[model samples]
Target: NLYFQHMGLLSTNFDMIQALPLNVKQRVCALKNLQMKTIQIESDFYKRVHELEIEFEGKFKSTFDQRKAIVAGEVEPTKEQIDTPILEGLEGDQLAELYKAAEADPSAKGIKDFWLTALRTHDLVAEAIEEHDVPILSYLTDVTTAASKDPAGFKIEFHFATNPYFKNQVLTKTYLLGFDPDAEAPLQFDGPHVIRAVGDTIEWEDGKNVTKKATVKADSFFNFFEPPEQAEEFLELDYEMGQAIRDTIIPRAVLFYTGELQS
Candidate 1:
């Protein structure tokens, strides 16, 4: 009993095993040995999986480097090099079928149009341009992507003309990850780094009556997507809004700036 306890096998119930038939005891011991061997096999399999992961990561990095170089016009990758495993195995007829199938997918076009509408209606994006501005919006074609280290953030920057109504020529809104979606709170900004609107004021006087009205002000870069402080159910909404900005707004803004989209 003492030896069994010291060996951490007291939970095996050696007294009950001794009470069983001799043949049964031997079978029980054999079952235990096989279980230990199974555990060792599981560990070996995990090691192999890790090796495969490392192999694929290296291949992925190489492909990304090649893509970066091609995009920068530093190098041109051959068709063979650019072809992925799926493409490499596809015959000409199959490739054409795939292209036609993808082209006919209504969901792709539906989603594209949905986001385009969202971008056009979005407060900051919508007010930034006018009817005539649509033609030359391609001049605002610069789209810059950035990442942060501390607190871990990402931003997409769009640069346009130096409008007098706005604070900056470039709008770069940072992002949030873990946040809430349903929480409603007033927009608040503490730092002096606030972007606001400045509009033209109209004033006229007729006899004793005076009329004054102000047009749109510093509304171009309101930083609407900026995350707020976290609380119960608030962080979730914040995260949801951030995801919308990152996914829906950024892509649409890029297309909008390139004159590839309409109002």
Candidate 2:
């Protein structure tokens, strides 16, 4: 119904469509595909942006450096020169905010604590901890929080051992937090790694109990730290814990720079 309303169609007709005649249902399915095309186009745009960044690597960095120089008062550039072509259409204020936060000492500290708190309180991550493994999470969270303080860039690589939560215990899920969404840069990571299934109880119809099988895929490692990607859905607690740590880094880094964590 929401989707119908979004597309300027009658929301009341949503249930009607479900109960419609077979031929009408088929027509609705086709219409649904047509609507989905727009989503695909938007998705393709992001993919193209990634590819474009790689293709325009030199131009992107050159433009970024030029803008940085201008902001730092090292260069008095003309309007055309100041507006770097590669960074065209990007918001200047947000960039300024990010840089301001970056230089703000107290703000940076807050960002670090933000991440530490996220890991410490996460439900999924807590479920994965054994009595002995409890201290490890705190250490990992601290390390990740500290790493985000780097101005240049940072990455968090999990070196896993043989654990019940994953098939390949030696596999690594590295969160590459260097990519700036507003900037031109291709995010990088080899992924779609499988995290082994774990068991949990689930309520079934009629109050019956069932053991649910859950498996997770590490598919979003490249953009894990980006804002829109933070609310990622995970199938298993293992993946959720990994992603929770990965996703918590960037915003906390931003907060650190912005002095949000300063007491």
Candidate 3:
């Protein structure tokens, strides 16, 4: 059984396979080989919003809820300073879909990065499913390969921006991998580093998604931190330059899954 533990989504693939009438033995064999190696994501769609501080209150909050981040694949580069954005390639039309949805629903702000992440995960999972009797299980195990190294699977580290402001904050202008790369393995970073996010979940759009219907704090939020110019370099912060990161439900799930396979 292929279980998406976090969302409680499962698929025996019995009906799906039977309907195909092809590759039955191979498919069943693949499913039997599948193992639940990682339950990396906990279904927290708000994590990315907190990480990016994109929360806003009143009418606009709902729109923010729909938007998500995603990592597709890694790029092969030596230096840590590169111009690879996780939100690249999305045109106004695709973005408009969210806008259109939000128009009808005032609380909705827009679509998020997670949608892309989920699709990418599906793509990887599909690849693994092809090999064994139980495709979903095979897909999960393959996606979460145990022998993989840090930033393994579909992610690569690259620099996107360099303190354009050159202010107190590192203002580090690089983004992490939200999807897998075309490469066979994870890329190498020059310095000792790992990618990570720092923040909390905030409610937006009048808290429509809030189960209890109780009021929380007013939304309009943002985050700004600056790195010390010259210090002893005492304690290490939780965040890294870049690793596997996304701002959507699916991308966040992928991060956990990637960590499960590699970390």
* Candidate whose lDDT is highest: 1
Question: All predictions: root-mean-square deviation over Cα?
Answer: 18.3, 16.4, 22.1
Model 2 regions more than 4 Å off: 1-15, 18-27, 48-118, 121-124, 137-156, 159-171, 174-236, 253-263
State every prediction's TM-score relative to the real structure.
0.29, 0.32, 0.17
Candidate 1 clash figure, as a count: 16
lDDT value, residue 207 of candidate 3 = 25
Give candidate 3 regions above 4 Å deviation. 1-225, 229-235, 238-250, 253-263
lDDT of 2 by residue, 63-140 (tens): 544533443345665888535532224477865664466453532221222333443355444344444333322222
User: Residue-wise lDDT of candidate 1 within 140-252, one digit each (tens)?
Assistant: 32334443434334455545443333334565655522111111321111111112211222121232111112533322223332333245245444444444555556545
Alpha carbon lDDT at 46, candidate 2: 51
What's the distance in Å from true for residue 140, model 3?
31
Q: Give the TM-score of candidate 1.
A: 0.29
Residue 209 deviation, candidate 2, in Å? 32
Clashes of each: 16, 10, 49
